[PDB]
């Protein structure tokens, strides 16, 4: 069960790396947007598309 705990910790760590790498916040991408938000970007405006 100690070996199991180490395996689970490693798997969760890899999941953390994957999520942080694909995260919108860290990658400056707006994956989720609304009908109004597509036209108007007051806070999320990063640069010209």
């Amino acid at each position: 069960e100690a070996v199991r705990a180490k395996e689970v910790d490693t798997l969760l760590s890899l999941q953390e790396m994957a999520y942080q790498m694909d995260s919108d916040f860290l990658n400056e991408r707006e994956t989720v947007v609304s009908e109004l938000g597509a036209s108007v970007k007051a806070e999320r405006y990063k640069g010209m598309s």
Binding site: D9, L12, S13, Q15, E16, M17, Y19, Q20, M21, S23, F25, L26, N27, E28, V32, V33, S34, L36, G37, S39, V40, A42, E43, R44, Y45, K46, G47
Partner: protein
């Protein structure tokens, strides 16, 4: 056990929008309002921040406030903007004019009745109100003025209720306002009198933590508000989720506020790393503590090494070992005696929540009542005194009927705050 939140002004509304984004994501709530979670724990304590509707929708217990209506289209244009009640949107024709006088006495007063009506609606529908939360910036007109007015009226009917205020203290280097010192000074005394506790978030510090630690090239206002949203989500984690050592806003206030006027804290979040440095970081407490107590992690631009920690609070979230989360704090207290006040032993309170934030295995939020909070109040106090000495920009405040004495009164109260921080820092056993 459930709290009701209010966002004031442009900055407050935009911060609260993404705060509700984080809360809904963590509770498995759709941007529309329907529940789409995969765990019972998500729905177990969803009443803390949400109220169930007629059709099963989950509406945030949130009151949106702004004298400027031109910026409250963006709050509903955000991805989760259609989550709020239409009747919780309170607007005025003209903006606050970046005027604390307009936001507190003339324009805010005509708008505060409906806001208090909505807040009383939320409180009455609320079963056992744990507290009122507020998100605003002290450098604005309807954020500082109307927010202080709101908390002042809130104390009139809820004295013992926890008044959270995530005040955004504007910084001179990232400044974009000239009446900045005036609004900050006029709001600081109201914050002292009408807030059980008030954490200070500085835009300079947010920009720095996004620039160095995150290293991401373009942290905009949304990216700055992301960290504040994460801190708000982590400060109430134990109210919504089970934990080995849970807590709530009152319990943190009791363990962090030694004297009634000393309720200004420093916020920190962990872990925060860049995209490139992601492979290279170890995910454990022996790394979370480093980031949390690190100088650059604070969201306030005044380095905690100035003074000594009165109290510290560590809201850890995730799968931790309780002795490994407490002996780290024992080690830091053991080995950093110079930055912890001697006459208050065991300054650090650690609390454990079982469920971490969504997408994170383990994290921690930091609340520090360090005596370095006087640094921001000073560096804006010299600016305010320089502005006031030559009577600069006082007609814009005296045209609303507000008299020149209240500037001196606010200066006196703010100087008293700074002086009591300094005296308690220099206190000896």
């Amino acid at each position: 056990r459930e709290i009701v939140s209010c966002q004031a002004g442009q900055c407050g509304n935009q911060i609260g929008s993404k705060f509700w984004e984080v809360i809904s994501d963590e509770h498995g709530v759709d941007p529309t309002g329907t529940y789409q979670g995969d765990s019972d724990l998500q729905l177990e304590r969803i009443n803390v921040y949400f109220d169930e509707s007629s059709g099963g929708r989950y509406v945030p217990r949130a009151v949106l406030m702004d004298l400027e209506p031109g910026t409250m289209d963006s709050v509903r244009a955000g991805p989760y903007g259609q989550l709020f009640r239409p009747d919780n949107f309170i607007f005025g024709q003209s903006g606050a004019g970046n005027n604390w006088a307009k936001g507190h006495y003339t324009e805010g007063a005509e708008l505060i009745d409906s806001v208090l009506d909505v807040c009383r609606k939320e409180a009455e529908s609320c079963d056992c109100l744990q507290g009122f939360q507020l998100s605003h910036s002290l450098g604005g007109g309807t954020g500082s003025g109307m927010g202080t007015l709101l908390i002042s009226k809130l104390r009139e009917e809820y004295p013992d209720r926890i008044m959270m205020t995530f005040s955004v203290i504007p910084s001179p280097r990232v400044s974009d306002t000239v009446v900045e010192p005036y609004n900050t000074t006029l709001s600081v005394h109201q914050l002292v009198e009408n807030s059980d506790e008030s954490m200070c978030i500085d835009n300079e510090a947010l920009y720095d933590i996004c620039f160095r630690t995150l290293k991401l090239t373009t942290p905009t206002f949304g990216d700055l508000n992301h960290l504040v949203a994460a801190v708000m989500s982590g400060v109430t984690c134990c109210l919504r989720f089970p934990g080995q050592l849970n807590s709530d806003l009152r319990k943190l206030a009791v363990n962090l506020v030694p004297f009634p006027r000393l309720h200004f804290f420093m916020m920190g979040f962990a872990p925060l790393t860049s995209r490139g440095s992601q492979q290279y970081r170890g995910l454990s407490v022996a790394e979370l503590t480093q980031q949390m107590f690190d100088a650059k992690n604070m969201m306030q631009a005044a380095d905690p090494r100035h003074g000594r920690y009165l109290t510290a609070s560590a809201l850890f979230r995730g799968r931790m070992s309780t002795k490994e989360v407490d002996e780290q704090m024992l080690n830091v207290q053991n080995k950093n005696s110079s930055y912890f006040i001697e006459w208050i032993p065991n300054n650090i309170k650690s609390s454990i929540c079982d469920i971490p934030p969504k997408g994170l295995k383990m994290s921690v939020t930091f609340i520090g009542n360090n005596t370095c909070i006087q640094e921001m109040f000073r560096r804006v106090g010299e600016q305010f005194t320089g502005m006031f000495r030559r009577k600069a920009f006082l007609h814009w405040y005296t045209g609303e009927g507000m008299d020149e004495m209240e500037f001196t009164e606010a200066e006196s109260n703010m100087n008293d705050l700074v002086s009591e921080y300094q005296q308690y820092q220099d206190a000896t056993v």
